[PDB]
Symmetry: C3
Subunit: 159 residues, 3 copies
Amino acid sequence: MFRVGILTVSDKGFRGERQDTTHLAIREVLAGGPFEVAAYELVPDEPPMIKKVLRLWADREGLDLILTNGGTGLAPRDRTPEATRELLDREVPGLAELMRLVGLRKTPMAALSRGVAGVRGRTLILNLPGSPKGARESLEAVLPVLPHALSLVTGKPWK
Amino acid sequence: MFRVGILTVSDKGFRGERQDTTHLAIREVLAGGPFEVAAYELVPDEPPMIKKVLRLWADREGLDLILTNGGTGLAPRDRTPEATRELLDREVPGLAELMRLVGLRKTPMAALSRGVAGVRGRTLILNLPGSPKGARESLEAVLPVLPHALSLVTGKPWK
Amino acid sequence: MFRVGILTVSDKGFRGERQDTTHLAIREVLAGGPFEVAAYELVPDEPPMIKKVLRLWADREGLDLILTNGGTGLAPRDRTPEATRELLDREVPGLAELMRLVGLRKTPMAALSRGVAGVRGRTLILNLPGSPKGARESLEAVLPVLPHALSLVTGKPWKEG
């Protein structure tokens, strides 16, 4: 199956101001599917630290999928999208749109996420919103096409 | 309460051929909300004139929200998106998507709006389509998340 | 009435005889509308070559609409979007979203297309997926606003009905 890395980006969480329960929601969404959580890391809202982990998991570990959560809001410090985009060879806008739950009749707060989606080498990277609820709904939105997308990027089977 | 600037981009309106009724629709959508229109300007489809007002409102007048309308279409003269995007520190694609009313069973003409959304300093800027109908419907789409987005961008609290 | 060019992007189009069924699917969607297919060509998955055709069709031939199909997937060889973007004066993201069938809960996989949409000179260019089914669904999604879009880009009129 596909090896996943979960990167939580949060100033408050990194400095111990609050606990990360978002990775727990993400794990639940992945459980049952063709996924294996190979790594987990918590970093503050700092591009330098976000990238190090992204490069590490993509270039050294060769993870198939990287799911970051947090740092995609409109707050000045939220810079996960910018950090991620700097490392992508190409983007997959369709996945970014899915994560924003585009199409719902009731305007979703998910629309405020600036998260991007793209490929670095043979690793798919998705920026999920930071809240437990947000990350969950956004991940569930892409789940239906995630396996096939990963097969195309990595070249590995799942079904 | 958030201070709003309405910038109408229209060759005809600027020429004085037909008056601007779009700002009226915008004001009505915002009515009853934590909004106060503090500035109104009318310019033609000229990038320099558009940029001039956007810079004045964001950099010196300190407005919280700038709502431009017009010049986002596919006509050769429609250059509001370009003129605006070049002044943004970062974009909020999710709001641009909401303004295109993405997801309606019947393909919307709003899909033909190239308007962008983003932040410059502590000012949120959205490019709405130019007609009263166009601006009205696109603004209604983003209204539900507008106060929250502004609180994050401006730092000003909102209940 | 708008002059349309259909460009089928692939290397498989230069190798064992086969009928281009995607090309046919596209013609069917346009049938009846203010469209006349004035050009059709096959091109390999070589960006330089894709650009040469797009360049000529827009700059020299003056086509109103260019519908490319294929090479929009997540595979390292699918570079139709990159090749296209490099030739556009401006993009029309709304059309790219329509081609991905966003929010229609019609065909989930359509969301993986990286096809772009934009204008070069007075030519509207859209990158449709490569399969007959994919190209068909993406084109039908934009069809309702395609004539209006072309009238603005080209400055040419069209009849309704």
